[PDB]
Design a binder for this molecule. Structure first.
Ligand SMILES: CCCCCCCCCCCCCCCCCC(=O)OC[C@H](COP(=O)([O-])OCC(O)COP(=O)([O-])OC[C@@H](COC(=O)CCCCCCCCCCCCCCCCC)OC(=O)CCCCCCCCCCCCCCCCC)OC(=O)CCCCCCCCCCCCCCCCC
Ligand SMILES: CCCCCCCCCCCCCCCCCC(=O)OC[C@H](COP(=O)([O-])OCC(O)COP(=O)([O-])OC[C@@H](COC(=O)CCCCCCCCCCCCCCCCC)OC(=O)CCCCCCCCCCCCCCCCC)OC(=O)CCCCCCCCCCCCCCCCC
Ligand SMILES: CCCCCCCCCCCCCCCCCC(=O)OC[C@H](COP(=O)([O-])OCC(O)COP(=O)([O-])OC[C@@H](COC(=O)CCCCCCCCCCCCCCCCC)OC(=O)CCCCCCCCCCCCCCCCC)OC(=O)CCCCCCCCCCCCCCCCC
Ligand SMILES: CCCCCCCCCCCCCCCCCC(=O)OC[C@H](COP(=O)([O-])OCC(O)COP(=O)([O-])OC[C@@H](COC(=O)CCCCCCCCCCCCCCCCC)OC(=O)CCCCCCCCCCCCCCCCC)OC(=O)CCCCCCCCCCCCCCCCC
Ligand SMILES: CCCCCCCCCCCCCCCCCC(=O)OC[C@H](COP(=O)([O-])OC[C@H](O)COP(=O)([O-])OC[C@H](COC(=O)CCCCCCCCCCCCCCCCC)OC(=O)CCCCCCCCCCCCCCCCC)OC(=O)CCCCCCCCCCCCCCCCC
Ligand SMILES: CCCCCCCCCCCCCCCCCC(=O)OC[C@H](COP(=O)(O)OCCN)OC(=O)CCCCCCCCCCCCCCCCC
Ligand SMILES: CCCCCCCCCCCCCCCCCC(=O)OC[C@H](COP(=O)(O)OCCN)OC(=O)CCCCCCCCCCCCCCCCC
Lengths: 171, 115, 105, 80, 347, 120, 140, 98, 175
């Protein structure tokens, strides 16, 4: 068959979000609130293209919008967030329920200094509508022409010509 | 990886409590101390004779009831479904069929032992 | 005697475990969902005799998704040629195929 | 029916407790108002990703942000 | 046996056959075969003598080995197709293993070595269940996988079954072994026409089940299990000798009888496909089946073997037996040839 | 052969298009032969239970005849339906494939040369 | 051994007698091994030496039948100059039948196997000529 | 295909020839049917866990169920052979040869 | 040689199958089948089926305990064949082992082999998925779907176990 078409190594270079998983999980609800739009454009492009190579640029927007999410935490509320992801980082299963006072301090400092509302129980699992200008992929499976089906039956059913025609049976 | 290291350690110092149990004491082997035990007297016949099982129907029905805890065991995961009345009906159907099986084995005297 | 009771009565006794492209719990895809969907949508209604030769390409892609025989044969060729060039000393592996590469994320 | 019940409670009380617990487990989920909330909790547990929709232009019930008022809510689970 | 338990076990045999017939999934085919075997084992051990236990052991081992090969064919189909639909098989290895499994379940030669043993060991009613109702689920699966059945394999199994079932019944005086080698030869006839026209396979299956049910109902109505006890029937109920005469001449493939109907149609579908040698050898080899049928008609109807004195007591007692559908099956097994184009309903 | 025809409409003994066909007459000689089979079943039924064969159980002989005529009527309907389906599919396949069925030019015997083989 | 019969039949008649004799010898040897396998299967020999004696006896019997069949058929096709002719295989089948009678040490089995194996080999040659099919592929 | 299917099919064939060649002892071959069920279990389960066809993951459990649901059957048919005869040797089951 | 761990466990699986398939004695047959069913729950546990390996381990432990009780009660002889007492046991045991390690040698030297199918010789780590399943192990979800989706399968399996008990109590009666 054909050559697989991969992007080059310079096409994949982007400033990564070089933080740990507890830093991400501690900031997760405000990330799902504030970084909604490029993330949903990316995941819509990701389920519609069904090909990561056609989803790189939108993905870079994700990696553009996450970092600006953290710098805006780093410029204003670096220390309550630092205590909060440290307390999240202690636990094995990384429980939100073991760290409610640092969560309250972080949410209070964020709501005062930046004006972000933490999403409630039920909001981040909603299915939202996304306004994009990219075209809908007309063939995301790279399929081809389906074969022509067999012709159907039509016409009124006439009786059998001279019956069964089985050797001598005249009916 | 760590599981096989732990099992290797357990098997290793279970078999190294045996190799220092045979090779450390002084052995005195003569062909009357290694004879079988029949409370001092010599054993009449071999112990490889057929020792008849009285609980044999219960032993075969254990093979069938042990399959039920391969069927009733996903119930902590089956309770997490979004077709839940159907799950509840099929779960109570399986325990009820096990119970009808046990009732049939009771009343036809299958749980009693022979002789 | 395929007394098709399930389509006569409209019941779904065992059409759900029939294929990998069916409705799965928690929308879990198989590893060959796209290949099997393409093969079934190709071969639907055209009968088995036309399906064995007019939908041969989708079924070859789907079988090679399932067993990965051409992929493992190609990896056999690549790994065997790499081991031969290591044994002859005519090729050295790069640092990102040895570990010291400061990986992506 | 009461004399036979007293007789089987006197002779085989383990089986009486067994059929009582089994009868409760049969009939009582059909007589509870909380069996609906079991299904509503299980279908509101988000295992998968909520794959978004392409905005065609006419979807008044689908939000554009999770903090929008339209969409499915879980206040019934918060109160109970 | 407790008759409630007999009803439940017979409905479970029927349920296993129906689950094989109606299901679109291979695991449910295998479940139906397992349920069928599991339920039919106490029908074989209805009497609790060593011959029924031996027959049930041999039947369990053959059908369990066949079900192992069937599930291996199913799993190889799962590998090479990623799916479970009961249709053609997507590998010749799975095709061979499933054809071997179904040939063992039918008792087709050279896997025939259990059918006279198991049929002799069990009663006539359970032998009837074995030779008729157990020939419905593997013929369903063979009807469903015929785009993948190897031609050489099913024709070798078929003609080898016809020859071995012909030669086997010539050396028999026991009626159940006669009906078992008759079964082997007739399953060879059914599977030889399987890839050419499976409507003729279904026709031969239905006419065979009618004639075999007639013969076992006549044996049960006369309480005869040997040739030499069937030969006393003229002194007790002489209409039964006429019925076994017409039914055994029907089973030999003689016109104008209905047992000539499948054979002829099978030849009628194998000469269309430019096979002339094979239905000719099949027809000539069916003369062996006709020969031991004629031996039974000589011993029963056309002559009068000497009876005993105690038969005079059995003159004073009529049959209180449930001879269920015996005149209907006797009429259908002998006088159905002018209705030969009815086979189109099996299309 | 015709198994793919009766797969969009499964387990229909008589489909709707089978009502577009003339049903068998009640004086169909095939149906009269099936009724004769019912009468012969009634005679064998009185014979094997040692009843008088012609006189005993006229209700039972009559239900034998009635049951065979009743089953055989629908069996003949399905028979005639399946042969009409066979002919309909034959004619539609010949019509939809003209290149596989060329119109033959029947030569007269003044151009057709046949070798004469004398019997002497 | 689908290829054994092919490498028997891919040779023109009356041309190379040694390779035809060897190919028919191998066909007979495979048939004798099948008969020997079922013979030690269904009827238990009293020892391993008796089992390999029965195996070697049946194998050499059927291989000698095949060898004398192929030899007689190809020599008759050479000396009669008629390669596509079933009388060659009639003579070869009677030679194989006399071989089977000499292995069974009797004249009546030899004459009966002469008649029926000659008719069988003649029918096989006629089937190779007119293209007769015993395992015919379904066409209609 | 993959390397492990070689040995799981090999174990099926080893248990097949072990079942299909009796050593005059019926329990030793009823173990071979249970081994064939084990090999079919592991083979089907490798195929199902490989391809992530998750809904057939309930299939080997069901398979395993019918495993013992016939194995118990064989044991219920082993004890009747070993009550008629003192041993469960398969050469005692030759009465139906005549 | 640690990437070949499923292959090595599968070698021990075939060795256990040659162990009980040679049929020494159902004591040692049960031993070999426990060893094979205990490395077979290590083969299939490395594919993600931790539930579906522990069950074929546990069901077969109960099964071989039952089979032990019967082969001590019914299938017992005075001198049981260990592995080497009979020449026909040891001969086919050595035969199965030599043929198994022969097809080990032909598949690690050549990296491909063909017995009826064609088989790779690379370690079977190559065919695994490069993704994650999230907060569910998918085989647990599929076996959990036996109650929601598998209702007919529940009905036929529970009916087969019910009539299995009834069938077995009808067999083991004698009269
Ligand atoms: C009709 C044919 C079927 C008849 C079955 C019942 C026969 C019977 O029992 O007769 C006894 C009865 C007389 O008996 P009985 O005096 O009451 O008491 C019994 C005797 O004591 C008898 O004494 P016994 O029973 O104590 O012992 C003597 C013994 C004597 O037996 C022996 O000695 C043993 C056997 C002797 C050697 C064998 C001889 C041949 C027997 C078999 C026939 C083979 C040829 C058939 C073709 C080939 C099949 C292989 O048995 C008999 O005599 C029984 C009589 C059987 C004669 C008929 C046989 C029927 C079955 C076979 C033929 C039909 C099926 C195949 C046909 C295929 C196509 C052609 O005979 C009749 O009544 C004959 C019928 C006459 C009236 C017919 C009226 C027809 C009206 C038709 C129009 C109205 C209906 C319209 C319907 C449609 C509406 C739309
Ligand atoms: C849908 C497909 C239906 C297919 C036919 C299904 C019924 C027959 C087969 C089942 C069976 O074993 O029936 C037992 C059978 C009696 O067993 P047996 O040992 O043969 O009878 C001996 C004596 O006749 C027993 O005499 P009895 O002392 O008990 O009293 C007389 C008895 C009293 O019975 C009654 O009064 C029954 C009342 C209830 C009837 C149901 C309503 C509820 O009436 C009869 O026995 C009349 C003769 C029965 C004939 C059985 C065969 C019928 C035709 C089978 C198909 C033939 C196809 C030929 C096609 C040829 C070309 C291919 O028949 C009945 O009990 C009733 C038959 C009703 C026939 C209805 C046919 C149309 C259905 C729609
Ligand atoms: C090239 C490879 C491919 C070829 C085609 C495929 C291969 C198979 C050929 C067809 C089948 C042959 C027969 C096989 C079984 C043999 C009978 C047997 O078991 O004997 C033991 C035993 C005989 O011993 P006995 O009863 O103790 O009495 C013996 C005396 O005490 C003492 O008497 P004895 O000292 O005389 O020894 C007896 C023995 C001695 O017989 C021999 O040693 C003769 C060996 C064959 C001689 C003729 C070879 C001719 C070769 C062709 C010509 C070569 C050139 C060809 C060139 C191209 C064509 C022109 O004779 C017999 O057993 C007679 C019956 C068997 C005749 C077989 C004729 C095969 C002709 C093949 C032509 C090709 O008989 C039985 O146990 C009978 C019951 C067996 C029931 C099951 C049978 C199943 C057979 C299935 C075979 C095919 C499997 C297909 C699998 C796929 C579908 C599932
Ligand atoms: C084939 C060759 C025959 C194989 C079986 C022979 C019988 C068994 C035997 O050998 O028993 C002795 C022996 C032990 O038996 P025994 O207890 O000693 O019995 C003999 C007595 O000692 C009695 O002492 P005996 O040996 O002196 O008497 C035996 C007698 C010796 O015969 C005589 O004493 C008088 C007869 C003289 C020779 C026959 C002349 C026939 C002339 C042609 C027929 C008329 C044709 C008219 C038209 C012509 C134009 C087309 O030979 C026979 O009875 C054999 C008859 C012919 C057998 C084949 C018939 C097939 C018919 C198929 C339907 C048509 O058993 C064996 O040696 C078993 C192995 C036999 C050979 C292995 C199978 C070879 C198969 C090769 C390929 C076959 C392909 C299919 C050909 C047939 C279908 C087209
Ligand atoms: C106002 C509105 C109402 C008006 C009402 C007006 C009418 C009132 C009466 C209505 C009731 C119907 C009456 C009969 C109608 C005509 C049927 C007829 O004769 O067809 C001739 C039919 C064909 O002749 P054709 O010259 O081409 O056409 C004349 C008609 O136009 C033929 O016309 P088709 O083209 O329409 O015929 C269709 C086709 C035409 O035929 C064909 O296509 C040729 C192939 C037919 C089947 C051949 C099978 C050969 C192998 C088996 C042989 C079995 C053994 C032979 C018999 C042995 C004795 C049991 O026949 C069949 O497919 C049916 C099969 C034959 C049954 C005939 C009806 C019998 C009813 C009474 C049964 C009594 C036993 C009969 C014998 C049992 C065996 C059949 O002849 C034969 O097939 C030869 C056999 C003779 C037929 C049966 C004779 C019926 C009267 C029997 C009275 C004596 C009974 C004595 C006791 C029982 C025997 C022991
Ligand atoms: C020929 C010949 O030699 O036949 C003798 C042979 C028996 O020979 P034996 O008596 O054993 O020495 O006899 C046999 O082997 C049996 C008969 C051999 C073939 C005879 C062929 C012609 C028979 C007459 C046919 C009439 C038409
Ligand atoms: C009574 C018994 C009558 C038997 C009549 C048999 C008539 C011959 C039929 C088989 C035959 O020889 O067919 C010819 C065929 C060679 O022609 P062809 O089909 O082109 O083979 C190339 C493969 N595609 O050959 C083949 O296909 C292979 C050779 C077949 C040989 C059949 C006989 C084997 C030995 C006797 C048993």
């Amino acid at each position: 068959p054909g050559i697989v078409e991969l992007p080059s190594l310079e096409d994949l270079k982007v400033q990564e979000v070089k933080v740990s998983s507890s830093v991400l999980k501690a900031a997760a609800h405000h990330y799902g609130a504030q970084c909604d739009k490029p993330n949903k454009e990316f995941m819509l492009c990701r389920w519609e293209e069904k090909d990561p190579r056609r989803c790189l640029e939108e993905g870079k927007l994700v990696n553009q919008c996450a970092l600006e999410f953290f710098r805006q935490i780093k410029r204003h509320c670096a220390e309550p967030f630092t205590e909060y992801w440290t307390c999240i980082d202690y636990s094995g299963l990384q429980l939100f329920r073991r760290c409610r006072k640092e969560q309250a301090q972080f949410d209070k400092c964020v709501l005062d200094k930046l004006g972000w509302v933490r999403p409630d129980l039920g909001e981040l699992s909603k299915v939202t509508k996304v306004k994009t200008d990219r075209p809908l992929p007309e063939n995301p499976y790279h399929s081809r022409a389906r074969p022509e089906p067999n012709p159907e039956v039509e016409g009124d059913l006439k009786p059998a010509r001279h019956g069964s025609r089985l050797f001598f049976w005249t009916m | 990886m760590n599981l096989m290291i732990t099992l290797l350690t357990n098997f290793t110092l279970a078999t190294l409590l045996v190799t220092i149990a045979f090779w450390l004491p002084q052995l005195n082997v003569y062909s009357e101390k290694t004879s079988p035990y029949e409370c001092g007297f010599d054993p009449m016949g071999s112990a490889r004779l057929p020792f008849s099982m009285k609980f044999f129907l219960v032993a075969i029905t254990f093979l069938l009831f042990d399959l039920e805890i391969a069927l009733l065991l996903p119930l902590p995961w089956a309770s997490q479904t979004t077709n839940l009345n159907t799950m509840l009906t099929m779960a109570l159907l399986l325990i009820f069929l096990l119970a009808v099986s046990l009732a049939y084995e009771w009343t036809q005297k299958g749980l009693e032992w022979t002789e | 005697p395929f007394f098709d009771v399930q389509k006569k009565l409209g019941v779904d006794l065992d059409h759900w475990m029939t294929i990998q492209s069916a409705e799965q719990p928690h929308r879990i895809p198989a590893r060959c969902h796209a290949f099997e969907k393409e093969w079934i949508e190709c071969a639907h209604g055209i009968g088995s005799i036309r399906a064995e030769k007019e939908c041969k390409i989708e079924f070859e892609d789907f079988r090679e998704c399932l067993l990965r025989q051409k992929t493992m044969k190609r990896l056999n060729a690549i790994k065997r040629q790499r081991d031969k060039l290591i044994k002859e000393g005519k090729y050295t592996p790069p640092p990102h195929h040895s570990g010291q590469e400061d990986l992506r994320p | 029916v009461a004399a036979f019940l007293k007789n089987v409670w006197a002779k085989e009380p383990v089986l009486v407790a067994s059929f009582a617990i089994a009868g409760l487990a049969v009939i009582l989920p059909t007589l509870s108002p909380y069996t609906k909330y079991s299904l509503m909790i299980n279908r509101a547990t988000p295992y998968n990703y909520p794959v978004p929709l392409r905005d065609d232009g006419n979807m008044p019930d689908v939000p554009s942000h999770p903090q929008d008022p339209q969409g499915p809510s879980l206040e019934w689970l918060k109160r109970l | 046996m407790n008759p409630i338990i007999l009803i439940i076990i017979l409905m479970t045999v029927m349920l296993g056959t129906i689950i094989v017939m109606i299901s679109t999934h291979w695991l449910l085919i295998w479940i139906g075969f397992e349920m069928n075997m599991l339920a039919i084992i106490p029908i074989m051990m209805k009497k609790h003598n060593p011959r029924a236990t031996e027959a049930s052991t041999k039947y369990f081992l053959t059908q369990s080995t066949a079900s192992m090969l069937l599930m291996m064919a199913i799993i190889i189909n799962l590998m090479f197709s990623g799916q479970w639909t009961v249709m053609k098989l997507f590998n010749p290895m799975a095709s061979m293993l499933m054809t071997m499994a179904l040939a063992m379940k039918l008792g087709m030669a050279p896997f025939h070595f259990w059918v006279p043993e198991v049929t002799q060991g069990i009663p006539l009613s359970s032998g009837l269940i074995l030779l008729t109702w157990q020939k419905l689920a593997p013929m369903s699966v063979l009807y469903q996988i015929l785009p993948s059945i190897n031609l050489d394999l099913i024709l070798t199994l078929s003609i080898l079954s016809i020859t071995i079932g012909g030669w086997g019944g010539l050396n028999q005086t026991q009626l159940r072994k006669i009906m078992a080698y008759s079964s082997i030869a007739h399953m060879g006839w059914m599977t030889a026409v399987l890839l050419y026209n499976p409507t003729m396979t279904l026709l031969n299956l239905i006419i065979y089940i009618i004639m075999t049910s007639t013969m076992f109902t006549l044996f049960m109505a006369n309480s005869t299990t040997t040739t030499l006890s069937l030969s006393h029937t003229w002194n007790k109920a002489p209409i039964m000798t006429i019925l076994v005469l017409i039914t055994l001449l029907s089973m030999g493939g003689l016109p104008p009888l209905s047992g000539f109907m499948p054979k002829w149609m099978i030849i009628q579908e194998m000469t269309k496909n430019d096979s002339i040698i094979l239905p000719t050898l099949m027809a000539i080899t069916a003369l062996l089946n006709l020969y031991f049928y004629m031996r039974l008609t000589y011993s029963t109807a056309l002559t009068m073997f000497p009876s005993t004195n105690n038969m005079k007591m059995k003159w004073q007692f009529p049959t209180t037996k449930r001879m269920t559908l015996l005149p209907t099956m006797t009429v259908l097994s002998t006088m159905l040839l002018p209705l030969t184009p009815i086979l189109s309903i099996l299309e | 052969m015709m198994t793919g025809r009766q797969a969009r409409a499964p387990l229909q003994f008589l489909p709707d298009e089978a009502r577009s066909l003339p049903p068998p007459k009640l004086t169909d000689p095939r149906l009269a032969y099936i009724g004769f089979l019912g009468y012969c079943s009634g005679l064998i039924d009185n014979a094997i239970r040692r009843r008088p064969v012609l006189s005993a159980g006229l209700h039972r002989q009559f239900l034998y005849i009635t049951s065979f005529v009743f089953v055989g009527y629908y069996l003949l309907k399905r028979q005639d339906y399946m042969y009409a389906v066979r002919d309909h599919d034959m004619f539609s396949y010949i019509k939809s494939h003209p290149e596989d069925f060329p119109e033959k030019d029947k030569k007269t015997y003044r151009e057709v040369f046949e070798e004469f083989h004398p019997v002497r | 051994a689908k290829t054994l019969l092919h490498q028997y039949w891919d040779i023109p008649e009356g041309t190379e007698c040694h390779r035809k004799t060897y190919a028919a010898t191998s066909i007979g040897g495979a048939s004798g091994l099948v008969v020997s396998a079922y013979s030690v299967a269904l009827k238990t020999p009293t020892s391993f030496l008796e089992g390999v004696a029965r195996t070697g006896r049946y194998t050499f019997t059927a291989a000698a039948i095949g060898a004398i069949f192929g030899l007689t058929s190809c020599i008759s096709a050479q000396v009669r100059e008629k390669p596509d002719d079933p009388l060659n295989y009639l003579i070869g089948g009677c030679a194989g039948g006399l071989t089977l009678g000499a292995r069974t040490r009797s004249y009546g089995i030899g004459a009966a196997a002469c008649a029926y194996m000659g008719l069988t080999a003649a029918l096989v040659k006629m089937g190779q000529l007119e293209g007769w099919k015993v395992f015919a592929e379904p066409k209609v | 295909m993959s390397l492990v299917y070689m040995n799981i099919m090999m174990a099926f064939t080893v248990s097949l020839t072990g079942l299909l060649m009796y050593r005059s002892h019926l329990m030793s071959s009823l173990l071979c049917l249970e081994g064939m069920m084990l090999s079919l279990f592991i083979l089907a389960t490798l195929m199902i866990l490989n391809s992530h066809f998750t809904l057939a993951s309930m299939m080997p459990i069901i398979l395993l169920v019918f495993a013992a649901c016939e194995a118990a059957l064989g044991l219920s048919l082993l004890v009747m052979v070993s009550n008629t005869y003192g041993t469960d040797y398969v050469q005692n089951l030759n009465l139906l040869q005549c | 040689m640690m990437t070949y761990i499923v292959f090595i466990l599968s070698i021990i699986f075939v060795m256990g199958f040659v162990g009980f398939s040679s049929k020494p004695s159902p004591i040692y047959g049960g031993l070999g089948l426990i060893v094979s069913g205990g490395v077979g729950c290590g083969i299939v546990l490395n594919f993600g089926g931790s539930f579906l390996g522990l069950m074929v381990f546990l069901i077969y432990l109960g099964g071989m305990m039952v089979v032990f009780g019967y082969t001590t009660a019914m299938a017992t002889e005075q001198y049981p064949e260990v592995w080497v007492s009979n020449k026909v046991v040891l001969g086919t045991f050595i035969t199965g082992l030599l043929m198994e390690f022969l097809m080990v040698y032909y598949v690690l030297k050549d990296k491909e082999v063909e017995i009826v199918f064609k088989f790779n010789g690379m370690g079977d780590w190559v065919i695994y998925d490069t993704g994650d399943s999230g907060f569910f192990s998918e085989e647990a979800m599929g076996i959990a779907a036996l109650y929601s989706y598998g209702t007919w399968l529940v009905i036929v399996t529970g009916w087969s176990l019910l009539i299995g008990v009834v069938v077995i109590m009808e067999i083991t009666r004698g009269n």
